[PDB]
Amino acid sequence: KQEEERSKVDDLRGTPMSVGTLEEIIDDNHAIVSTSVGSEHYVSILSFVDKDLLEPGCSVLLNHKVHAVIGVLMDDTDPLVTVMKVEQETYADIGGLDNQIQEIKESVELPLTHPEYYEEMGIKPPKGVILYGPPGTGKTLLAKAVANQTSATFLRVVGSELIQKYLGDGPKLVRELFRVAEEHAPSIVFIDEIDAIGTKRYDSNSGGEREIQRTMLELLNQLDGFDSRGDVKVIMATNRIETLDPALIRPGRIDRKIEFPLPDEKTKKRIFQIHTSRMTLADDVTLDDLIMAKDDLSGADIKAICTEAGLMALRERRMKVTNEDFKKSKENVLYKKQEGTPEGLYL
Amino acid sequence: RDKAPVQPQQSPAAAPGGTDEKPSGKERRDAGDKDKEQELSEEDKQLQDELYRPALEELRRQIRSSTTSMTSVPKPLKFLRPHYNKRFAADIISVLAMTMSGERECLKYRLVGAGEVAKEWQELDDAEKVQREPLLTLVKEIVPLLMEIEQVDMLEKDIDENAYAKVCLYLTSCVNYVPEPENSALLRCALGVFRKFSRFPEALRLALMLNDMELVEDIFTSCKDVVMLGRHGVFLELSEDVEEYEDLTEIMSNVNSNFLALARELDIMEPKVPDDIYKTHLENNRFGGSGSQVDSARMNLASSFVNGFVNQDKLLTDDGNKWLYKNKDHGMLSAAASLGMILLWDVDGGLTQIDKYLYSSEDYIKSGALLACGIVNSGVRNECDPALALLSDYVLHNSNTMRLGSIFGLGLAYAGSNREDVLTLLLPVMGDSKSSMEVAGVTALACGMIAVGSCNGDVTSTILQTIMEKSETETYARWLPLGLGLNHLGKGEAIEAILAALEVVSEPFRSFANTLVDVCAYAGSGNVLKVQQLLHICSEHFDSKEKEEDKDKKEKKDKDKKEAPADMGAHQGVAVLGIALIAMGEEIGAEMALRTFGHLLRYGEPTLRRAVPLALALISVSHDADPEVSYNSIFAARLAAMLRQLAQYHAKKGTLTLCPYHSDRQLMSQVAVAGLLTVLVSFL
Amino acid sequence: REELQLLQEQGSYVGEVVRAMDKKKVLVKVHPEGKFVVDVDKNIDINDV
């Protein structure tokens, strides 16, 4: 019966079930496998259990004695599903770009959700935008707020999440996440800090000249090359502009680009009231003095400064926060800051 | 300061000493103590001691609620009867009394069932009214009606906060987290406090759920007291079930002569179609694009159906002739009724357009013409008469197909409280039970749709005779349970499932009927017992009861649909992949609908690849034609082109839209079954 | 001292295990090799891994 069929399928299997990546679709009941060291014979492939479901370059079950194709690999999962396969919205504290929000909207949601305009005005959707600037000003923050502000299930993909030194694990995660983006849904595969090709290295990593080079080749051929977009929103924002390979600076790969200054007085007071709200404010302290002195508050000093000001105060268990506590909080946060002459020597 | 002077005051049992330390305890109780009250194991020895032993119990409950307990903490308080908005008042009221009286009330609500607990509950409710804090006080005082009196004792000034937040979150957790019975008292007290309030839509959804005829009279006399009004009748008809519209129209016909015009018919549709021609502007090249699909007389059939459902005019109505002559018998049923689809308005125009196909040369022409006459409107009840007399044939005559059409059109048109004349004529419809499945199909369907939304259904003799005559001869056993469960609809606590298990259980046909009755008894609330029942009985060997039994999901758990995705596709009973396909349905089509459709689109069976476009294009009413072109590339037999045209159609709790797709859920049959497919009128 | 004939054949090494699974199987990181689902013993339960 069926139990006997399963017992026979197990009879075909050798107790030590090695693992070998398929090389090519050759269906004369034998394939050309590649185990952890690349055992590539014309080993038989079990016919009844699906022999042709898995593609070439995919892990399958292998024998030990003859390394025969034992079967399709088990359901494997990458360590990023919880971040990518997603189970703050527009703005919980309006007071920042107040515009790049709208622009990433028009560049991602409007194209993706209603792509009935690119034939309405002979146009093409933005296949890629880059957003960059200081180490935290409103680049990835907007993307995080855009994840909730969308009619689609966004995906979070840390640029370093794709750094696994296993053989082809780079291309493996490319394949997995892209089979997601294409055969899960029209998703929002957001990948940040993707500028990691320029001027550093790792200890938990081998020679990148020949380890992640073909990995990036696979990733590029996947995203904006072959098996092209269609409607697969995978936009690549950054922080820098320089250290990158111009193989993608050319359009097509990515079309638009956006930067991020640091917020202005109008937005300084905004994010102040956003953060200074977390404490019973001693209103005699002058936010505007902090705003003009710290006139280049990317967005970390504001948060850190107000949190540490609350800490300074509530160390004394006071409700109000005198100005000196704010001074100490900021100056601890704000090291190495000398904005006087120059200049410094004028008006 | 140091406890060295103030700690040893607990060793003596002096009455003046205790009674001058315990008020000092109240004074130092602003921060509790110098610390987290480590004076416990040195004061627990004083439990046996007995002037101000009320203050002694105050100190005792303070320190015990300061460390931990569940029952020994509130005893001193209920033994205290607290006597004798500050930070110390914050301490011993807000957080302390919250946790304290909360565990006390939970223990007394799960253990016994005195008045002292209601006293504490009222006192803390007034205290939190002074605190003005909802969303934790309300949700904690939910489980102790106590709720009704708390509402009518709190609802005086705060209108927005209480009503919006409390009512919405509690109704959400009442269809999601709370069971049904207490939601009835919720409904009653909300009805009261909203009769005290404005913004009638709250009472209108209170009626949408309660299914009440007093609420509709009150909201009508008040919405005449509060003079938009046309739009108000429009979405009153859009919100009302089938039971309350006839009761409301007759209780009005008893007593401005315009609420009769609005909330029965002919006024929800009077402003719509003109403004559709005005502000909506569809082009004519879609008629062609969807119509330029090469003629196949069955692909041409589906294309005629699609372009019949375009709605900027009735172009397809008057598109010459020979399109219906090209069609065949059941295709002629669909196309002669297609003219009613393009004309679901114009009461007078409906007759002046269909009388040319009424009583005409072809039997299918006249039957589908009566079908369209029933389709076009639901308030004229004058097109019923010319058919009602004919319907009787007793075996296999023209008026049997005309009876299919007109019985369905009258179940659609008029669905009163209990309309018996159509039932006295349906008794000869089921008593005949012509070999065509559609006869008994529409018999049960009309009986249900006029009996849906009933007061917990009914155990009346009609569906009982129907069960008898169905068990007499074993799609009949599939679509007669359709009407059975439809008559079961409107239930909140009906015992119909038990009587059906008593009379019906048999070989898996009537066992499937029993599980149909079960599916139509638990529309959805918090009753996860039946959910684990379904989880286990899904492993039943019968691969057919699985279908509807798991398809009940999209009804049971529709509100917080985030858990609706299950492992149905990961299951291997391919009918269960179709189950999930149904479970997606026709709503706004979230990205998770597309998540299912990503794989459910690419399928090979001409039945489930035929079941997926229905749900996909019905859930999305470039972006949308993308699965259309996807199927165009997927297939390029005839079923593939037919499902493609079905999707082309679909592209361009009300019971009105609850039955038809479950009726269609037996799609694996002939196009004669698809001959009655043109009855799914559920969109505006 | 007689027992020591066991000490002539195999000081079985530590094979890493990504995780457990049913069918009496796991995802063993064969430390100086790849991952290859292999057999188990009949002593501990599947969840134990």
Ligand SMILES: Nc1ncnc2c1ncn2[C@@H]1O[C@H](COP(=O)(O)OP(=O)(O)OP(O)(O)=S)[C@@H](O)[C@H]1O
């Ligand atoms: N709407 C907003 N516009 C601009 N800034 C905001 C906004 N909302 C919050 N912020 C602040 O901006 C910061 C966002 O920093 P992020 O860009 O998320 O940091 P990051 O992405 O880790 O930066 P790097 O380059 O990876 S170190 C937060 O710390 C917020 O305080």
